[PDB]
RNA sequence: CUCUAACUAUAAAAAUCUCUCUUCUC
């Protein structure tokens, strides 16, 4: 039966789309299904800020960030701990985990 | 050269490894106090304790 | 008493190959003893052990036994080896076969002439084996070319003259070799006289055959002579066959008939 | 500036055997070239931070012998249509370059990201595992 | 580690005494001419270095070369062209953004617009320009996204490549990097199309250098003292 | 009754299984 309202792949109008790669696994998974996670973090983590502030030619020097979307597989989002199984009440929400620090 | 370095831990984070046997700790150098470390002990521990380390630069990772 | 290491030093160098005897196994690892060199101790960790899977260690180690191995780190202060097993290449275990086996001969030899003489093989290998590595190589091509060519012991001395004279005794006695070299001469002669030919041939033949190896044409079929050689100094054989070949050219080459050849002189 | 010999750290640090490679200003010289696995035995640990702060150690020691005192860290991953995101060990070797004496100067990330990738390996379902 | 399997199909020295270090001098458009050092073999004569020098780029961050930091994110990459001994002169070759920059605009719900123009400068320099624009949330944008029409899109590449166009035609890579620097044609380019989009974060990145005349050395040093 | 900031990072191997099923009416 149906256990997805939505099939999983978010499409609803495009017939097809094109596909994308795993970053772990390599499976060709289409754009909408395959699930998205924005890595925005910090080019040296807080283990080493001092130590980087400390030794570092331009005082107040602002450290870059790095960006990347991975697309993940599917079974690699589940595997990988990236995305859960739910309640079957709860797949209801597509709101993200409520924001995990303010 | 013998670079053996002690360091006092200010706090405990918790039990680790799949033995559960080892623990993880933050300790700070007993020379500038404000520079710490997270390392791995394997024994018992608390508030307090001096560790005695071979190595500085090494920051410990979770074990699984 | 079996000590006084084959190299100039006691302790290893880091990345040589070595070959090991196993003594015992713990838990972390086993800390063997070395017989390349003679006796210092290491550890071979269980992680750099196995090629595959560490499943079993009796099966592998087999304690007891001879095993290939490098090493790694040094500790040149009091003596402690750290060692390596599953970085053994398919070609390093073969020249670790070679240089162990004359490393043993070397050893064997020399541990037979201070149990003969009752001294202790760290004089005997610093007056006797030393000077040869240090000139040659290695001591077993100084054998070889004493039991050839004996200008080897000049310059070198002895404990004493009679340790040379058993030492040569025993080179007499355990290292005797040649080397069969075989060729084959193919025959085609169909010309009027043709068997006082060979006649001839061998009568020139052994007419050139030195007194220590000797000179023999043997007969296995009409068109295939062979030509056995006890190459004692595995050079003036391959000499040796050549003019022989050379006379038998000049025996065919007039009476009306031919030659030809399959296999020239090969050790 | 006080004569801060500059060079560029150009860090490579994929998901095995990282690069710690230092360069002058223009790239074209190449000196201290020494790698993660240059250091480090288990050959399946080329990755782990240990190897990358031993290579660094080295190149810092190299390099002040040289004469260079500060660096540009250029951080790259294994880029290309690989997973372009920086291996383990690449972050302890800039940690480990900064302690060693050496000043940080404009930390970069040159990682070659594509307009897209021409093919990526492992067919239609991937590497199954 | 330590293994090789030698499939190889002393006479070793220090290669650091047949070397020296030479010094990278800057265009006069910008204020720290003193770049930094390059490590070069010592002179041969049956090579000479100076051979070897001049093709050499070096990449240089844009704020190490006007001591602010507004430029942090910009950075320059000059030619090798003339030594004088013991100090060489660069030229401009090339100009180009931080990623770190670059994936920082370059954001989800909100359209890039990109410009792509190749023309020959007032000299017969060649160059090709780059110029990437984001649509911007007005001000009272209760609705969320910022997305731009393809009209409007269409229209804003025109005005951009017009512009750029107007501004390398008329002016040399001195003057053009005289006015790169204050980022003045980021603010025109703005301007001019207030009236079609928004256009948050109107950059100039990547502008790249496809050919170079001949040797005009009268110029070039002209440029530096 | 006014609000978008923090973060990483595990994939070794494991095949198969002969019974027999039994009523709810105060
Ligand atoms: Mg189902
Ligand atoms: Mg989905
Ligand atoms: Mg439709
Ligand atoms: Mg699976
Ligand atoms: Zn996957």
Redesign the pocket.
Same mark, same amino acid.
Not at chain 1, 78 to 82: K, S
């Given at each position: 039966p149906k256990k997805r309202a939505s099939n999983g792949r978010n499409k609803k109008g495009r017939g097809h789309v094109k596909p994308v790669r795993?970053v772990?696994?390599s499976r060709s998974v289409p754009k909408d299904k395959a699930i998205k996670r924005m890595? !925005?973090?910090?080019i040296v983590?807080?283990?080493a !800020?001092r130590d980087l502030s400390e030794a570092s030619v331009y005082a107040e020097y602002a450290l870059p960030?790095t960006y990347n979307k991975?697309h993940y597989?599917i079974?690699?989002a !589940?595997?990988?701990?990236?995305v859960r199984v739910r309640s079957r009440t709860d797949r209801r929400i597509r709101a993200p985990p409520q924001?995990?620090?303010? | 050269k013998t670079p053996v370095t002690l360091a006092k831990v200010i706090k405990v984070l918790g039990r680790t490894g799949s033995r559960g046997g080892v623990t993880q700790v933050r300790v700070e150098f007993l020379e500038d106090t404000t520079r710490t470390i997270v390392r791995n002990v394997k024994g018992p521990v608390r508030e307090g304790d001096i560790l005695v380390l071979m190595e500085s630069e090494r920051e410990a990772?979770?074990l699984? | 008493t079996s000590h006084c290491r084959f190299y100039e030093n006691k302790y290893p160098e880091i990345d040589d190959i070595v070959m090991v005897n196993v003594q015992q196994i713990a838990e972390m690892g086993a800390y063997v003893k070395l017989l390349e060199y003679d006796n210092i101790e290491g550890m071979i960790l269980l992680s750099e052990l196995s090629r595959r899977?560490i499943r079993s260690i009796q099966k592998l180690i087999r304690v007891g036994k001879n095993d290939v191995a490098v090493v790694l780190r040094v500790d040149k202060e009091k003596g402690y080896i750290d060692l390596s097993k599953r970085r053994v290449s398919s070609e390093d275990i073969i020249k670790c076969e070679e240089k162990y086996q004359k490393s043993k001969t070397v050893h064997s030899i020399l541990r037979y002439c201070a149990e003969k003489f009752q001294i202790p093989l760290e004089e005997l290998y610093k007056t006797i084996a030393w000077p040869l590595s240090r000139k040659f190589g290695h001591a077993y091509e100084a054998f070889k070319l004493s039991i050839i060519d004996e200008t080897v012991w000049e310059g070198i001395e002895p404990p004493s003259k009679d340790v040379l004279d058993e030492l040569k005794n025993y080179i007499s006695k355990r290292l005797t070799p040649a080397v069969k070299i075989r060729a084959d001469v193919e025959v085609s002669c169909f010309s009027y006289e043709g068997i006082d030919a060979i006649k001839d041939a061998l009568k020139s033949a052994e007419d050139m055959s030195t007194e220590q190896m000797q000179v023999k044409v043997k007969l296995v079929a009409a068109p295939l002579y062979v030509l056995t050689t006890q190459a004692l100094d595995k050079q003036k054989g391959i000499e040796q066959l050549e003019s022989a070949i050379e006379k038998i050219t000049e025996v065919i080459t007039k009476y009306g008939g031919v030659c030809n050849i399959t296999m020239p002189p090969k050790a | 500036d006080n004569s801060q010999v500059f060079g560029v750290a150009r860090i490579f640090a994929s998901f095995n055997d990282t690069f710690v490679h230092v360069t002058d200003l223009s790239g074209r010289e190449t000196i201290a070239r020494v790698t993660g696995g240059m250091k480090v035995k288990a050959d399946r640990d080329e990755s782990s931070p240990y190897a990358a702060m031993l290579a660094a150690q080295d190149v810092a020691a190299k390099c002040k012998e040289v004469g260079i005192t500060a660096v540009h860290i250029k951080i790259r991953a294994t880029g290309g249509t690989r997973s372009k995101?920086?291996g383990?060990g690449g972050?302890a070797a800039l940690r480990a370059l900064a302690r060693s004496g050496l000043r940080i100067g404009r930390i970069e990330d040159v990682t070659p990201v594509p307009s897209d990738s021409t093919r990526k390996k492992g067919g239609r379902r991937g590497?199954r595992? | 580690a330590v293994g090789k399997n030698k499939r190889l199909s002393k006479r070793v020295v220090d290669p650091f005494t047949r070397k020296e270090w030479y010094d990278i001098k800057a265009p006069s458009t910008f204020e720290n001419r003193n770049v930094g050092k390059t490590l070069v073999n010592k002179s041969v004569g049956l090579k000479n270095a100076s051979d070897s020098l001049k093709g050499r780029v070096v990449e240089v961050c844009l704020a190490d070369l006007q001591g602010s930091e507004d430029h942090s994110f910009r950075k320059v990459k000059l030619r090798v062209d003339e030594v004088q001994g013991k100090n060489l002169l660069t030229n401009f070759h090339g100009m180009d953004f931080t990623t770190d920059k670059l994936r920082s605009m370059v954001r989800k719900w909100q359209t890039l617009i990109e410009a792509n123009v190749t023309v020959k400068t007032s000299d017969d320099y060649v160059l090709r320009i780059f110029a990437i624009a984001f649509t911007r949330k007005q001000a009272n944008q209760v609705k969320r996204t910022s997305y731009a029409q393809s009209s409007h899109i269409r229209q804003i590449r025109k005005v951009i490549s017009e512009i750029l166009t107007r501004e390398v035609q008329n002016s040399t890579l001195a003057q053009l990097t005289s006015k790169l620097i204050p980022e003045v044609i980021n603010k025109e380019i703005e301007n001019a199309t207030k009236d079609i989009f928004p256009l948050q974060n109107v950059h100039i990145r990547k502008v790249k250098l496809l050919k170079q005349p001949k040797f005009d050395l009268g110029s070039l040093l002209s440029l530096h003292g």
């Open positions: 795993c772990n696994c890595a !925005i973090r910090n983590e807080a283990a !800020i960030k991975l597989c079974s690699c !589940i595997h990988a701990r990236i924001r995990p620090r303010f | 990772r979770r699984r | 899977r | 995101t920086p383990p972050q590497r595992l | -």
